[PDB]
Amino acid sequence: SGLRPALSTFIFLLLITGGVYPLLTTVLGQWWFPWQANGSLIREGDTVRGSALIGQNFTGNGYFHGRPSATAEMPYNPQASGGSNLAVSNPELDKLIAARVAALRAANPDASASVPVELVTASASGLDNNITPQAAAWQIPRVAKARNLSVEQLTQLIAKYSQQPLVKYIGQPVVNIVELNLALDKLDE
Amino acid sequence: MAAQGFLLIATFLLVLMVLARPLGSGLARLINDIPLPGTTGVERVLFRALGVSDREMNWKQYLCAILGLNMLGLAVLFFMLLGQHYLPLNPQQLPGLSWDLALNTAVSFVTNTNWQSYSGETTLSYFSQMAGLTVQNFLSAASGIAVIFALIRAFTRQSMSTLGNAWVDLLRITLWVLVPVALLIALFFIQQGALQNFLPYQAVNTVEGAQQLLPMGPVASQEAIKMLGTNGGGFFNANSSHPFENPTALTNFVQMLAIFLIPTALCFAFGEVMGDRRQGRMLLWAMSVIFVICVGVVMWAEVQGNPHLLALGTDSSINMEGKESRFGVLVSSLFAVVTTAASCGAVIAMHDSFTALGGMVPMWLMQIGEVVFGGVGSGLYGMMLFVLLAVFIAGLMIGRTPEYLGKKIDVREMKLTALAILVTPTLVLMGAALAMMTDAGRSAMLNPGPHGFSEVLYAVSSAANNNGSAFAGLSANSPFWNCLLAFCMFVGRFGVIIPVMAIAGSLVSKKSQAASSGTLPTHGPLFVGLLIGTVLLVGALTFIPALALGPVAEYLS
Amino acid sequence: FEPTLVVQALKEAVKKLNPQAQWRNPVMFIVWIGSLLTTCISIAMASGAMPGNALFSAAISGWLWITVLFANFAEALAEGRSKAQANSLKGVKKTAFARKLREPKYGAAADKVPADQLRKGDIVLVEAGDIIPCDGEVIEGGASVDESAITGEAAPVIRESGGDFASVTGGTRILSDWLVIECSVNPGETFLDRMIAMVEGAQRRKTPNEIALTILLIALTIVFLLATATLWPFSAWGGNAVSVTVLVALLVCLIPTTIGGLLSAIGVAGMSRMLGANVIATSGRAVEAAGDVDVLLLDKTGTITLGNRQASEFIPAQGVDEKTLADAAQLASLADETPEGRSIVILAKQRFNLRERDVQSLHATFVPFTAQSRMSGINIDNRMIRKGSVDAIRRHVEANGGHFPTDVDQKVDQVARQGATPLVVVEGSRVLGVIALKDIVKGGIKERFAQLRKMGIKTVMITGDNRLTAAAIAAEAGVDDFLAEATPEAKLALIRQYQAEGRLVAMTGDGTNDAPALAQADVAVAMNSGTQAAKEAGNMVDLDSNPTKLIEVVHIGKQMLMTRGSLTTFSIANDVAKYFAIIPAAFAATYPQLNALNIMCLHSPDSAILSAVIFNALIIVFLIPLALKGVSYKPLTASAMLRRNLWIYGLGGLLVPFIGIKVIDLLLTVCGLV
Amino acid sequence: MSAGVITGVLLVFLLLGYLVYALINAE
Ligand SMILES: [K+]
């Protein structure tokens, strides 16, 4: 049964928390914070160069190779938003990480004897645009030799596009790959 | 990195205890039925306009009202997901979902469980997310906090014959408890970077020449209830790992605070309305010790990480193939323990790629019953069922009649508490066993070895413990998997809820007895130890072989 | 210890347990199902099956049957006599031997007939010193019958004929005279059958502690059955799966059979310890429940009274003297077999020390209690000694024609309102006095009743006797509010009311009247001075005559509730530790790398689980010596007593399982049975 | 083919139902 005290209450709750709440929150977001609420896109001209949160493939040399994606259809597919769910004991993860570390060693011959873990292990969402400063600084000389740049100005570029948390223990200091690559493309000319 | 975890846990616990007290006092006013300041007349006008008015109802009327509202919302969501074509706000003409996935999502977004088996960018439309799923999260959170309000009112009411008013309680819950906090955290999500617009899917031209399509949707309006009501299913396949979903570790902290804000506020409200804060601090200390020790071991296992990665040339052997970099590994482990303790399905990181021990301990808190810093309303009455368990275990250990909070407990409460406690281990064991019988569920493997059985056990436990968290990569699009999880979620939450109203009705009809020689003191370190030993050992009794044949086997091998 | 003949008959009753009644006890019936399955797989191995090991499963089945037999043994030792027996009522119904007539007259054609001979319309005489066969109405004549089953009073009542007093219920012993009775009530559904209907149908309710323990057993058994049942499909992902017989062994080993054995070990220890207060306890559940009682129902005649009615004082009139009625009373009680007459003789020596009145040297013409005149006594050559009740006195006065002594009448109704039954003597014209036969109180029960009041037990006296003397006895004994002139059905209704109020009720009595009250009572105490029916019914039989044995009963009940809580602590800890002790044996077979979880390095999983079966068979045996000779007996507060109990018995319930499994596996390994 | 697997499942189901029955009603 239920009658009016059930039906009208459910309609009021649905109306308030499905129309009024998202309408007011959308109005507040668009009125206050449009660039943040629109996806933090990079709009050079009328063509979108990307967004400052997701991250792209960056398979070319001297483009600051990012974290592995391992999404559904293609690498760094934003519509998939899945991750490599491979286990510890899974040999498929071992073969994938061995092939990837072989490719990384072939690409960077004198970066370091070892390799950072985050540059070879896939991210949780498959879309990680942020890299720890030590892993970003691991690949200084290859990018420097590719783009004819100096390690000095390269490390101030990495330091200047660095996001630091409010406190140390809440997370990790990071750098953004996409903004750094667009800065490199702007520094091309 | 050893002390960093201690500072992180201490900071999170202190900010939680700071934020809990005003919301605890407000919620205690909601048990006490005194109107909140500034809302005395407008709520009366609203109740008169809706027609609920004032009508005190007993436990049977309360229970059928709550389940009637939940079933009506279930039918509304099922029809709304079925008719996805005809609804407006479809920038991409997405096909309507199948009957099995529609039933799964309909029973999932109701009853607080909020399990996800799809990817919302290619399956769910705007208007379903914007209208149906958000209000279903709202109604699930309101129903949980209303059922715990009824249980607290049954404890604090002496020799009465009613519990309150169902729709009055739900309105006063979801109009002034969830919505303002939702605004205050959704605007923070927008400030740090989230999506609250209605633009169509946008093409992106990268520097590599491979164009892509950005996901699009009103993210923060769903975030502010997914974290607050501990639901745990987002727009995207990554529940809380997508960059548009959760931008920054500061927002990760706000998400952790929103997940644990409601249950500890309920605990403080219960302590304040009992008249003594000793009970409130007793439950919170009992949950805090388990929370601290279980963020421990998980943190150690995740910083130990992969043994193969150290020998394969990586400088650090830290487990990182299931997490991200903006938030590290310690905060990943903290959020994993939080979301597996609070029955929230929101994963900050891929739980399937964790270390065996550091995935089994969050699975341990997953299996046990979501009672330690638990659901939006589920965890508090889980703790109340387990403390009633500990009360009569102490009573039969002492050889006298067991009473709790000055109220005598008898055989009807005995049987109903036993059923409410043992209904979820029965489901999480029998459904998982049935899944391993069938070749179809065994066809949904991703990781060979014991990890596949661990994935199955995690999925069934997420269904029947009302969590929503998942080892990802399970092909849960099968009709068999969808129907099994659907039935598990349904009978699990409702066969917990119905005995809660049975206990509440059987406690309303009694009276608060005076002090007696055989009355167990219901506070102190002894009672904390008894309660934690009770819940941990009954969970051990019903979950040693299931964990031993899976993740413990993977760790030993 | 208990006598060999009764424990042998009880063990025969144990072997009488079929599966039709085995499902009363759920954990032991689940052990019984597991035993049936392992015996069936053992005889399948004997006939030939897929595996090759048979003697191991045979030993499991044998030790499981030993466990089942001992658990049922202890259960029957505790509650094999808890059911109220109606053997005395059945025997007094089946003795029959009625004197049937075909013509209503004092003599006529009378023959011996059984009880089934009676029907609608019959004529039976009962003469003197026999048993009434059935309920009926008086045709002619007068009879003095002893209302033993009704009102519980041994004092005889005259019935006569042609009035309101023609209803003889049957089963009441006729004292003298003769009577002819018309059988109006059919064989079946008579007064004795209405009594036996709920003397047989007792059905005592379960104590709340026992119900809570049973619920805990069901919960833990559901947990362990769940684990052992889901172990089968969870091992299908391994290289080799778990075996069905070892899964059955896990199912019968994990479940809390220790607490199920404790549920009757407490009762066995209770019946053992009840001999300290000299009470034959036929069931230990009442001994356990004695610590949670709140009321005490009591019967006047037999329990509070010494039994027979005593003589208080000779009350004369103003025209006579103490000697002048004492000599007449002594003459009236010369050839008197009644204990009241012996009391008259005792009071005669207490007052006058009267002698030389020999029973046969003096020509004592004895006139018995007449049917039509209700007068009795002794006649000598010059003095006619008779005595009787006041109505017979007035009839004799009317027959003589003299003036009536209304002063004697107000004296006797004053002492009747006091609570005495009058007995007026007739000599020395109509102005001689009366013997005050009043009820007598036992040895200082008022202080014990005040102690009961201090403890919290509400004493309510219900007897079915006269209201005035019942109130007098309640006032003299310090009893609380009381009931009088109550049927056995009224006593049953009072027991049901006190049970429906929630509190446990204790009933103590001696007669056949309150046999339904003892049958429906929770802690029922019989009396050795009473009849056989009260001793057959109930749960306790007092060896002494003391009615206030319930003080010691409640003290031992509280002490044994404390030790029951201690044993429950030990048993819960034992089962919890045993689960962890024998749980890794399920993992070494299906997974090789989990043997490091085995901790103790057990020789083999089969040996470990067989040791678990041995521990199962041994712990229920060892509980009874542990139930005996307890350690903690002085009361403390709740929190500190729980702390001490949890410490001292959780250490035991943790150390005993691991030590027991290790020791039994070492014994099996050095015996080479693996 | 389930030689005894389905019989075991039926036995566990019936035994669990009996256990719930004994939980509801104090025998
Ligand atoms: K729940």
Residue numbers in the entry:
A (entry chain C): 2 to 190
B (entry chain A): 1 to 557
C (entry chain B): 9 to 682
D (entry chain D): 1 to 27
Task: Show the paper's wording.
KdpFABC is a high-affinity prokaryotic K+ uptake system that forms a functional chimera between a channel-like subunit (KdpA) and a P-type ATPase (KdpB). The heterotetrametric KdpFABC complex comprises four subunits, namely the channel-like KdpA, a member of the superfamily of K+ transporters (SKT), the P-type ATPase KdpB, the lipid-like stabilizer KdpF, and KdpC, whose function is still unknown. At high K+ levels, KdpFABC needs to be inhibited to prevent excessive K+ accumulation to the point of toxicity. This is achieved by a phosphorylation of the serine residue in the TGES162 motif in the A domain of the pump subunit KdpB (KdpBS162-P).
To determine the predominant states under turnover conditions, non-phosphorylatable KdpFABS162AC was incubated with 2 mM Mg2+-ATP and 50 mM KCl for 5 min at 24°C immediately before plunge freezing and analyzed by cryo-EM. The second structure obtained from the KdpFABS162AC sample under turnover conditions was resolved globally at 4.0 Å from ~28% of the initial particle set. In the respective cryo-EM map, a density is observable immediately adjacent to KdpBD307 and the TGES162 loop is in close proximity, which is the hallmark of an E2P or E2·Pi state. However, on closer inspection, the density fits better to a to a covalently bound phosphate than to a coordinated Pi. In light of the ambiguity at the given resolution, we have assigned this structure to an E2P state which might be transitioning to an E2·Pi. In comparison to the E1P·ADP state, the A domain in the E2P state has undergone a tilt of 60° and a rotation of 64° around the P domain, positioning the TGES162 loop to dephosphorylate KdpBD307 in the P domain, while the P domain is also tilted by 40°. (C, D) The outward-open half-channel closes off at the KdpA/KdpB interface, while a new, inward-open half-channel opens from the canonical substrate-binding site (CBS) in KdpB to the cytosol.
